[PDB]
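May I ask you for just one protein sequence along with its backbone structure tokens in two labelled lines?

_____
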Amino acid sequence: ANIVGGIEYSINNASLCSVGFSVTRGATKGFVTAGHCGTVNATARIGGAVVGTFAARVFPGNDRAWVSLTSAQTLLPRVANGSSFVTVRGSTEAAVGAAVCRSGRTTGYQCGTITAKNVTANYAEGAVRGLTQGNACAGRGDSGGSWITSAGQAQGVMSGGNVQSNGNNCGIPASQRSSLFERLQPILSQYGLSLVTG
């Protein structure tokens, strides 16, 4: 399968999440995603085919994971935006007030701005600290998906948000949205990963 940020993958033939970013660890191919999406050694499938397994994760506390892929997978420096793509050019962390977009299998590609950093989310499983908040909308299934600026700087992976009964927070004004992502830079150094860029 071609690994692009934002696309769907399933975990142990049950939950769905979205691919964050193609990465390598030496000769090993992988992608980063959200830790709450799977446990270590859980099987990841894209389009019904097994593409790899969860290598490591931390959730709650943090919310991060990477999936090591088989060598047959094609890693690409891209994030899906409809039928088009945003090229991943680096991982310079943007400041509060910067515009940012996110890609995922439930609401697609949505943009907004970063409104706050170092936010705590209190999930049913426990607190996750140090998250950045943006007001781009998102929904259930979008977790693990890419957050990236239009200039191609990779920011992090979708963690959670104040979704409403329709499964997302796209039907409430931007001012009322809290969509949270896990910063990419600590995930890359923690697992010794390099981002695939183009």
Observations:
- The first strand starts at residue 2 and ends at 5.
- The chain has two domains: 3-76+184-196, 77-183.
- The domain at 77-183 is CATH 2.40.10.10 (Thrombin, subunit H).
- Residues 14 and 154 are 28 Å apart (CA to CA).
